[PDB]
Structures are given as C-alpha cells and as structure tokens.
Amino acid sequence: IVAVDISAETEKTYLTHVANDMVIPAYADAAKQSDLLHDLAQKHCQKAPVSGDELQALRDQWLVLAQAWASAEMVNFGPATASMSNLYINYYPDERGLVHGGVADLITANPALTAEQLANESAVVQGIPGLEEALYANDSLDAGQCAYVMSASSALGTRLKDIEKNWQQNAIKLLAIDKTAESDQGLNQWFNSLLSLVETMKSNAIEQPLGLSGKAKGHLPAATAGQSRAIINAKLATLNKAMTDPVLTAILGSNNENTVADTLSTALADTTALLAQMPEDLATADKATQQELYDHLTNITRLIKSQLIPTLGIRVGF
C-alpha cells in the first residue's frame, strides 16, 4: 500500500506525452479513417447501385474506422463529450435498438441527405452505428442509401477533426499539465478514464449483452457487422499500450512497485490470448468462454483499482 513519489515535472512530462503520443494521434487516426470511408463512398456511389467488391470495401473500411474510434474511447472527457458529440459519433449502448428503425426512416424521408442536415437530426441516426446499419441493411446500396453513407461519414469526419483540433489547442488546460505542482487533477482524470474504458467494456459490452449475470440487455459493439471481437481487441491493445508504456513503467518502477506493471502486462496479454481464440462475433462463442473473458476483464479492473491507482497515489473515481 506504499505510493511511489512522482515529481511535478515528471507528472507534467508524462501528461504531455499522453496528449501528444496517445490522445491526439487516436483522434487524428479516427478522423483519417472517417475521411477514407467518405472518399471511398464518394468514389463508388458515382456508379450506384453499389454492391460486390465495392460494398465489401466500404464495409471493411467501416470496421477500420470503428476500431480507431474504439481506441480513441480511452478518453471519456473533454472535447469528445462537448455538446454530446461522442453520442453523435458512437451512440452506444443502444438498449432500445433506436439506431435500426431510425436510419431507414431517415433515408426514406431524405433521399438527397447532406452532411450538414444531420446536425439537426438525432445522434441515434448517424455516426459509427448509423453507418454500420446503412452498410449492412442489404447486399446493395441504392442512390438514397449512397447519399446517407457519404453524409454520415462526412458529418463524422467534421466532428472528429474538431475534437482533434480542440485537443491540439487546449491539451495543457484539459489535462491540468501546468498545475501538477498544486494538484494531481490530470493524472487522476487520465487513469480514471482508462479504468472507465475497461469497466464500461466488461459491463455494457460483455456482461449485459451476453446475459452473464441475468437477462441479456443491450447489444455487443458491431453487433450488425458481427465484428465484436475486433472492437474488444482494439480497446485491449490501446489499454495495453498505455499500461506497458515505458514512461509509465519507469514512474511505477521507482522501488518494489515494479510488480504492478508486470501483473497488469501479464493480465492484459492473457485476455488478448483468450480473445484471439474466440469467434469474430463474441455472441457465437461458448457461454463458459464468454464468462472467462468477463472474469479476465474483471481481474484487469481489480488490478487498476487496488494496485495501479494507490501506487500512483491517485483515487478510484473522478
């Protein structure tokens, strides 16, 4: 229960490294992937209806984008939460299945939909789950469905670039980088954000949709695409990148608390190895294997709350 000593300068340097090497690149990558999805849709929709190889390429690029945003979700505060932009980006959980019915109604009502028009439409009919629904509704995209995919990926691109620009401008204020000498506000928010990533993942994405504790509630991420394993893997790899980061392991490895970084690294590697032997759609896995995945995720939250957070001298909960 002995907390390591972190200087105001070491903390400032770590938080600056987190903004520049993890937060800003994750948002930049999600924006880049949304731009590539838009550009591919703009190209293929000139020869509408879109099917075969062209529709598969749009579906494959949607997954690359869904994986990039899953990684960017390691941050649960700041610009991504402004004017609930994150729900316009990824409306999840969707316990009442509002995305499915809304997207089709919107396309019927607006066959010549524009990206700007979606700003006044609900968050439920756009973003990553909106695009998923439009790309997986049929084995063909007609003129109206084509206009939606271009509008939604364009509106998504604009929101992601605005978040990236906001972090580039206000990183110091957002992570209290200049106030490390008086408070650990930045370090506390950052690790509680990482804890929230695995907590909302094991609860909303694993326990509840697979009905491990009781009756099933909600859906797995990428349920329509059947690519839940790819979403959980992207989140695990991002958490592993943060936990096995040499800058952080040096902060933890000041005494005998070097065992904290070793136990977290081993636990993340075991979860990744277990996920790799499961199917593309985690819902089609055995009930015992799904329970094993939940148990591994519960052990990671345990290690963060009881070993990582007290060693860093911060608190469970923001």
mmCIF file of C-alpha atoms in Angstrom, residues 57-278:
data_model
loop_
_atom_site.group_PDB
_atom_site.id
_atom_site.type_symbol
_atom_site.label_atom_id
_atom_site.label_comp_id
_atom_site.label_asym_id
_atom_site.label_seq_id
_atom_site.Cartn_x
_atom_site.Cartn_y
_atom_site.Cartn_z
ATOM 1 C CA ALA A 57 -14.503 -2.385 -49.407
ATOM 2 C CA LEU A 58 -16.953 0.099 -47.736
ATOM 3 C CA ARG A 59 -17.772 -2.493 -45.011
ATOM 4 C CA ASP A 60 -14.052 -3.276 -44.421
ATOM 5 C CA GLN A 61 -13.174 0.453 -44.124
ATOM 6 C CA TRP A 62 -16.132 0.975 -41.705
ATOM 7 C CA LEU A 63 -14.511 -1.672 -39.367
ATOM 8 C CA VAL A 64 -11.055 0.101 -39.593
ATOM 9 C CA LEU A 65 -12.889 3.333 -38.541
ATOM 10 C CA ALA A 66 -14.913 1.563 -35.762
ATOM 11 C CA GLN A 67 -11.617 0.081 -34.403
ATOM 12 C CA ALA A 68 -9.898 3.580 -34.478
ATOM 13 C CA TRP A 69 -12.766 5.200 -32.551
ATOM 14 C CA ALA A 70 -12.829 2.258 -30.047
ATOM 15 C CA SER A 71 -9.164 3.152 -29.306
ATOM 16 C CA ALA A 72 -9.970 6.939 -29.019
ATOM 17 C CA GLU A 73 -12.690 5.983 -26.428
ATOM 18 C CA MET A 74 -9.789 5.558 -23.878
ATOM 19 C CA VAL A 75 -10.591 9.308 -23.211
ATOM 20 C CA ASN A 76 -14.110 9.763 -21.693
ATOM 21 C CA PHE A 77 -13.767 13.528 -21.003
ATOM 22 C CA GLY A 78 -13.165 16.838 -22.766
ATOM 23 C CA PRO A 79 -13.881 17.794 -26.408
ATOM 24 C CA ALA A 80 -15.398 14.371 -27.345
ATOM 25 C CA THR A 81 -18.149 14.981 -24.686
ATOM 26 C CA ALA A 82 -18.820 18.645 -25.728
ATOM 27 C CA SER A 83 -22.457 19.088 -26.992
ATOM 28 C CA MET A 84 -22.660 15.208 -26.585
ATOM 29 C CA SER A 85 -20.583 14.869 -29.802
ATOM 30 C CA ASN A 86 -19.441 11.318 -28.714
ATOM 31 C CA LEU A 87 -23.101 10.104 -28.953
ATOM 32 C CA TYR A 88 -23.290 11.662 -32.487
ATOM 33 C CA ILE A 89 -20.029 9.738 -33.173
ATOM 34 C CA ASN A 90 -20.969 6.401 -31.484
ATOM 35 C CA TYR A 91 -24.472 6.097 -29.986
ATOM 36 C CA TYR A 92 -23.755 3.182 -27.620
ATOM 37 C CA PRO A 93 -25.205 1.397 -25.594
ATOM 38 C CA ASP A 94 -28.478 1.235 -27.590
ATOM 39 C CA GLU A 95 -30.595 -0.951 -25.247
ATOM 40 C CA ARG A 96 -33.855 0.000 -27.070
ATOM 41 C CA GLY A 97 -32.478 -0.512 -30.620
ATOM 42 C CA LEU A 98 -33.199 3.080 -31.707
ATOM 43 C CA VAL A 99 -30.452 3.057 -34.435
ATOM 44 C CA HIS A 100 -32.031 0.302 -36.696
ATOM 45 C CA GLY A 101 -35.510 1.852 -37.310
ATOM 46 C CA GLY A 102 -34.382 5.478 -37.332
ATOM 47 C CA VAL A 103 -31.722 5.149 -40.070
ATOM 48 C CA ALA A 104 -34.149 3.576 -42.636
ATOM 49 C CA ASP A 105 -36.909 6.163 -41.792
ATOM 50 C CA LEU A 106 -34.369 8.997 -42.278
ATOM 51 C CA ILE A 107 -33.158 7.653 -45.700
ATOM 52 C CA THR A 108 -36.818 7.278 -46.950
ATOM 53 C CA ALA A 109 -37.564 10.853 -45.740
ATOM 54 C CA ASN A 110 -34.293 12.327 -47.168
ATOM 55 C CA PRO A 111 -33.056 10.619 -50.403
ATOM 56 C CA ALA A 112 -30.797 13.679 -51.065
ATOM 57 C CA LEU A 113 -29.453 13.978 -47.486
ATOM 58 C CA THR A 114 -26.480 16.294 -46.873
ATOM 59 C CA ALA A 115 -23.797 16.047 -44.124
ATOM 60 C CA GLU A 116 -24.900 19.453 -42.667
ATOM 61 C CA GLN A 117 -28.553 18.315 -42.418
ATOM 62 C CA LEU A 118 -27.556 15.501 -39.969
ATOM 63 C CA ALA A 119 -26.520 18.173 -37.350
ATOM 64 C CA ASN A 120 -30.260 18.812 -36.729
ATOM 65 C CA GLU A 121 -31.088 15.056 -36.824
ATOM 66 C CA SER A 122 -30.808 12.838 -33.706
ATOM 67 C CA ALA A 123 -27.450 11.224 -32.743
ATOM 68 C CA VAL A 124 -29.201 7.797 -32.974
ATOM 69 C CA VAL A 125 -29.485 8.004 -36.849
ATOM 70 C CA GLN A 126 -25.787 8.776 -37.546
ATOM 71 C CA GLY A 127 -22.136 8.127 -36.560
ATOM 72 C CA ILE A 128 -20.420 4.707 -36.451
ATOM 73 C CA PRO A 129 -23.680 2.679 -35.601
ATOM 74 C CA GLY A 130 -25.681 4.660 -38.224
ATOM 75 C CA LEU A 131 -23.102 3.848 -40.947
ATOM 76 C CA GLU A 132 -22.976 0.202 -39.776
ATOM 77 C CA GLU A 133 -26.748 -0.106 -40.188
ATOM 78 C CA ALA A 134 -26.774 1.556 -43.654
ATOM 79 C CA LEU A 135 -23.834 -0.620 -44.937
ATOM 80 C CA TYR A 136 -25.266 -3.918 -43.553
ATOM 81 C CA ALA A 137 -29.035 -3.354 -44.263
ATOM 82 C CA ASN A 138 -28.748 -5.013 -47.724
ATOM 83 C CA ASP A 139 -26.141 -6.530 -50.110
ATOM 84 C CA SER A 140 -26.636 -3.394 -52.288
ATOM 85 C CA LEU A 141 -26.681 0.412 -51.770
ATOM 86 C CA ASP A 142 -29.148 2.408 -53.886
ATOM 87 C CA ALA A 143 -28.858 6.188 -54.659
ATOM 88 C CA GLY A 144 -30.567 7.230 -51.347
ATOM 89 C CA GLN A 145 -28.530 4.778 -49.202
ATOM 90 C CA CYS A 146 -25.358 6.042 -51.003
ATOM 91 C CA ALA A 147 -26.215 9.693 -50.143
ATOM 92 C CA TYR A 148 -26.623 8.673 -46.466
ATOM 93 C CA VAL A 149 -23.233 6.843 -46.232
ATOM 94 C CA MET A 150 -21.484 9.902 -47.763
ATOM 95 C CA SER A 151 -23.421 12.343 -45.487
ATOM 96 C CA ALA A 152 -22.868 10.333 -42.267
ATOM 97 C CA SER A 153 -19.130 9.658 -42.879
ATOM 98 C CA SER A 154 -18.654 13.389 -43.838
ATOM 99 C CA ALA A 155 -20.542 14.599 -40.695
ATOM 100 C CA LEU A 156 -18.454 12.109 -38.648
ATOM 101 C CA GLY A 157 -15.201 13.419 -40.216
ATOM 102 C CA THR A 158 -16.098 17.038 -39.302
ATOM 103 C CA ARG A 159 -16.832 16.100 -35.630
ATOM 104 C CA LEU A 160 -13.602 14.042 -35.254
ATOM 105 C CA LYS A 161 -11.379 16.780 -36.782
ATOM 106 C CA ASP A 162 -12.985 19.356 -34.469
ATOM 107 C CA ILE A 163 -12.108 17.139 -31.419
ATOM 108 C CA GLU A 164 -8.515 16.620 -32.753
ATOM 109 C CA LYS A 165 -8.113 20.457 -33.275
ATOM 110 C CA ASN A 166 -9.529 21.134 -29.746
ATOM 111 C CA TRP A 167 -7.037 18.733 -28.040
ATOM 112 C CA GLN A 168 -4.110 20.233 -30.100
ATOM 113 C CA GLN A 169 -5.150 23.721 -28.913
ATOM 114 C CA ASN A 170 -6.225 23.066 -25.276
ATOM 115 C CA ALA A 171 -4.251 19.892 -24.115
ATOM 116 C CA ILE A 172 -2.468 21.780 -21.224
ATOM 117 C CA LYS A 173 -5.783 23.052 -19.739
ATOM 118 C CA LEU A 174 -7.666 19.729 -20.429
ATOM 119 C CA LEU A 175 -5.022 17.588 -18.595
ATOM 120 C CA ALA A 176 -4.067 20.332 -15.979
ATOM 121 C CA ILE A 177 -0.453 19.954 -17.279
ATOM 122 C CA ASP A 178 0.630 23.408 -15.862
ATOM 123 C CA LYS A 179 -0.967 22.723 -12.412
ATOM 124 C CA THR A 180 0.893 19.443 -11.443
ATOM 125 C CA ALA A 181 2.653 21.246 -8.506
ATOM 126 C CA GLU A 182 -0.686 22.075 -6.743
ATOM 127 C CA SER A 183 -2.958 19.133 -7.816
ATOM 128 C CA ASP A 184 -2.916 15.656 -9.444
ATOM 129 C CA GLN A 185 -6.179 16.568 -11.366
ATOM 130 C CA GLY A 186 -4.701 15.491 -14.737
ATOM 131 C CA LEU A 187 -3.190 12.144 -13.675
ATOM 132 C CA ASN A 188 -6.380 11.299 -11.689
ATOM 133 C CA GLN A 189 -8.713 12.045 -14.668
ATOM 134 C CA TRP A 190 -6.472 10.175 -17.171
ATOM 135 C CA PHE A 191 -6.270 6.866 -15.198
ATOM 136 C CA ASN A 192 -9.957 7.021 -14.190
ATOM 137 C CA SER A 193 -10.679 7.409 -17.936
ATOM 138 C CA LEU A 194 -8.602 4.241 -18.617
ATOM 139 C CA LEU A 195 -10.414 2.446 -15.750
ATOM 140 C CA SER A 196 -13.797 3.575 -17.266
ATOM 141 C CA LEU A 197 -12.733 2.075 -20.659
ATOM 142 C CA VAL A 198 -12.428 -1.499 -19.243
ATOM 143 C CA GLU A 199 -15.348 -1.045 -16.729
ATOM 144 C CA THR A 200 -17.901 0.060 -19.430
ATOM 145 C CA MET A 201 -16.451 -2.651 -21.733
ATOM 146 C CA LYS A 202 -16.939 -5.586 -19.286
ATOM 147 C CA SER A 203 -20.417 -4.278 -18.160
ATOM 148 C CA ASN A 204 -22.104 -2.683 -21.242
ATOM 149 C CA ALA A 205 -20.311 -4.637 -23.980
ATOM 150 C CA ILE A 206 -19.771 -8.097 -22.348
ATOM 151 C CA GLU A 207 -21.830 -8.904 -19.163
ATOM 152 C CA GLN A 208 -25.133 -7.207 -20.160
ATOM 153 C CA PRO A 209 -25.486 -8.200 -23.919
ATOM 154 C CA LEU A 210 -24.422 -11.831 -23.324
ATOM 155 C CA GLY A 211 -26.614 -12.124 -20.172
ATOM 156 C CA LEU A 212 -23.907 -13.471 -17.839
ATOM 157 C CA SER A 213 -25.420 -12.043 -14.574
ATOM 158 C CA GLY A 214 -29.116 -12.161 -15.595
ATOM 159 C CA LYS A 215 -31.358 -11.466 -18.622
ATOM 160 C CA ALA A 216 -29.495 -10.053 -21.671
ATOM 161 C CA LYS A 217 -29.728 -6.248 -22.070
ATOM 162 C CA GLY A 218 -28.275 -4.252 -24.954
ATOM 163 C CA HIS A 219 -26.007 -5.437 -27.769
ATOM 164 C CA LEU A 220 -22.337 -6.202 -28.365
ATOM 165 C CA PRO A 221 -20.372 -3.435 -30.167
ATOM 166 C CA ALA A 222 -20.559 -4.014 -34.017
ATOM 167 C CA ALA A 223 -23.491 -6.487 -33.491
ATOM 168 C CA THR A 224 -24.962 -5.983 -37.025
ATOM 169 C CA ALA A 225 -21.490 -6.290 -38.686
ATOM 170 C CA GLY A 226 -20.705 -9.290 -36.435
ATOM 171 C CA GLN A 227 -17.282 -7.825 -35.615
ATOM 172 C CA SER A 228 -17.399 -7.563 -31.762
ATOM 173 C CA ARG A 229 -14.020 -9.389 -31.335
ATOM 174 C CA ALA A 230 -12.299 -6.636 -33.442
ATOM 175 C CA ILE A 231 -13.832 -3.851 -31.237
ATOM 176 C CA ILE A 232 -12.828 -5.536 -27.889
ATOM 177 C CA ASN A 233 -9.299 -6.255 -29.322
ATOM 178 C CA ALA A 234 -8.791 -2.583 -30.392
ATOM 179 C CA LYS A 235 -9.764 -1.420 -26.850
ATOM 180 C CA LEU A 236 -7.491 -4.057 -25.179
ATOM 181 C CA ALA A 237 -4.488 -3.150 -27.423
ATOM 182 C CA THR A 238 -4.947 0.600 -26.583
ATOM 183 C CA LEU A 239 -5.138 -0.167 -22.820
ATOM 184 C CA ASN A 240 -2.041 -2.453 -23.181
ATOM 185 C CA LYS A 241 -0.162 0.397 -24.997
ATOM 186 C CA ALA A 242 -0.964 2.715 -22.021
ATOM 187 C CA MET A 243 -0.149 0.093 -19.274
ATOM 188 C CA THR A 244 3.143 -1.203 -20.865
ATOM 189 C CA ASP A 245 4.250 2.375 -21.808
ATOM 190 C CA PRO A 246 7.970 2.746 -20.795
ATOM 191 C CA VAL A 247 7.326 6.322 -19.467
ATOM 192 C CA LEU A 248 4.677 4.948 -17.037
ATOM 193 C CA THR A 249 6.599 1.719 -16.092
ATOM 194 C CA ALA A 250 9.563 3.998 -15.071
ATOM 195 C CA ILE A 251 7.204 6.022 -12.768
ATOM 196 C CA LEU A 252 5.921 2.730 -11.194
ATOM 197 C CA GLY A 253 9.401 1.129 -11.107
ATOM 198 C CA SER A 254 10.930 3.525 -8.533
ATOM 199 C CA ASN A 255 11.051 0.816 -5.763
ATOM 200 C CA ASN A 256 9.410 -2.694 -5.397
ATOM 201 C CA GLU A 257 6.133 -1.497 -7.084
ATOM 202 C CA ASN A 258 7.699 -2.805 -10.397
ATOM 203 C CA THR A 259 5.489 -5.940 -9.809
ATOM 204 C CA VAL A 260 2.359 -3.728 -10.501
ATOM 205 C CA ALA A 261 3.439 -3.115 -14.159
ATOM 206 C CA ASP A 262 4.395 -6.845 -14.545
ATOM 207 C CA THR A 263 0.997 -8.187 -13.224
ATOM 208 C CA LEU A 264 -1.029 -5.727 -15.406
ATOM 209 C CA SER A 265 1.085 -6.586 -18.528
ATOM 210 C CA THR A 266 0.586 -10.371 -17.931
ATOM 211 C CA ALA A 267 -3.213 -9.960 -17.288
ATOM 212 C CA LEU A 268 -3.684 -7.880 -20.500
ATOM 213 C CA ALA A 269 -1.639 -10.459 -22.512
ATOM 214 C CA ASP A 270 -3.786 -13.379 -21.127
ATOM 215 C CA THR A 271 -7.051 -11.523 -22.032
ATOM 216 C CA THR A 272 -5.683 -10.794 -25.572
ATOM 217 C CA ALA A 273 -4.672 -14.507 -25.988
ATOM 218 C CA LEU A 274 -8.160 -15.629 -24.792
ATOM 219 C CA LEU A 275 -9.926 -13.168 -27.154
ATOM 220 C CA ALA A 276 -7.801 -14.387 -30.156
ATOM 221 C CA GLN A 277 -9.171 -17.985 -29.872
ATOM 222 C CA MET A 278 -12.837 -16.739 -29.753
#
